[PDB]
Design a protein around this ligand. Structure first.
Ligand SMILES: C[C@H](O)c1nccn1Cc1cc(-c2ccc(C#C[C@@H]3[C@H]4CN(CCCC(=O)O)C[C@@H]34)cc2)on1
Ligand SMILES: [Zn+2]
Length: 295
């Protein structure tokens, strides 16, 4: 059977908020069966806990933000992506400030820390959300779609009018999340980055945690990790946003110029349309359409 997973040991990391520029201490802890991923602002007294679910999504401009009243947890998507890629169902994520650390801009450092700590299978079946009808949302020239598929695959297509250039498809029957997606970094363009900074955003961004692009080229001295790094990172972002469903997907995602906002609308519409999905478990791992690496 495919079993739920938590962390075997706690993970501690420190780093900086991409947007706030604040220093943040992060802890991932084990959690019980059916907890989900829950973020906790431990700098506050009392502590404010915000389940990583679609209904708690507040701000969707330049990152995915979770909100409960006037308290926020910003930039959850890269860490969530790491957790979906490793099959982590249950975990507490404690943060000493409002924003998850950006690390090197990718999910790589989070996956390494997690896998160094190890995972723990738990004695309860892993629940999956299986797409049974096509669900599509559009706004302007952006589109995001779920399609029935016996496995898990993601496609993204961006239309950037810029010299540095994209589309990519990843099916997890052959693509390795760890080797081919997790290392793809955050990116931004100089004119936007300075707009953002002028609006008190992007305060922690630097070549240390992002691919920085001027009008023509990548300015990072050591260049790119993958030739299609930009689009691979969008796939990473989409994986994190989709994990806000609260369970892993059995289906296909296709994004066409979609960001955090549209991804969140897609999740909302799916949740609402209860004929388009059902919760399934696999009591025999041997016959399941997906598999996970050893814990
Ligand atoms: C998070 C979301 O999931 C997401 N993933 C993918 C994309 N995004 C959106 C996103 C990207 C960014 C973002 C913000 C800032 C920077 C940057 C930057 C460095 C600063 C400092 N540098 C100065 C160098 C010159 C000198 O040496 O003096 C140049 C410039 C890059 C990217 O913010 N939001
Ligand atoms: Zn991102």
């Amino acid at each position: 059977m495919i079993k739920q997973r938590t962390l075997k040991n706690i993970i501690r990391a420190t780093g900086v908020g991409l947007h706030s520029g604040e220093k943040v201490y992060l802890t991932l802890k084990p959690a019980p069966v059916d907890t989900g991923i829950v973020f906790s602002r431990t700098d506050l007294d009392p502590v404010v806990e915000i389940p990583a679910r679609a209904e708690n999504v507040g701000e969707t401009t330049m990152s995915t933000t979770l909100v409960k009243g006037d308290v926020k947890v910003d930039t959850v998507e890269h860490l969530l992506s790491a957790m979906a890629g490793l099959g982590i169902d249950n975990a507490y994520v404690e943060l000493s400030a409002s924003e998850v650390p950006i690390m090197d801009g990718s999910a790589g450092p989070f996956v390494f820390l997690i896998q160094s700590a190890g995972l723990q299978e738990q004695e309860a079946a892993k629940k999956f959300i299986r797409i049974k009808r096509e669900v599509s949302v559009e706004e302007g020239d952006k589109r995001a779609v779920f399609v029935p598929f016996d496995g898990f695959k993601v496609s993204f297509e961006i239309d950037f009018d810029h010299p540095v250039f994209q589309q990519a498809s990843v099916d997890f029957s052959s693509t390795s999340f760890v080797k081919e997606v997790s290392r793809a970094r955050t990116f931004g363009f100089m004119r936007d980055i300075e707009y953002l900074r002028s609006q008190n955003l992007a305060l922690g961004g630097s070549v240390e945690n992002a691919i920085v692009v001027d009008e023509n080229r990548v300015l990072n001295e050591d260049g790119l990790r993958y030739e299609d790094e930009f689009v691979k990172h969008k796939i990473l972002d989409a994986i994190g946003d989709l994990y806000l469903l609260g369970n892993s997907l059995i289906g296909e995602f296709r994004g066409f110029k979609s960001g955090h906002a549209l991804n969140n609308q897609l999740l909302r519409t799916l949740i609402a349309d209860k004929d388009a999905w059902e919760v399934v478990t696999f009591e025999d791992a041997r016959t399941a359409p997906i598999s996970y690496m050893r814990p």
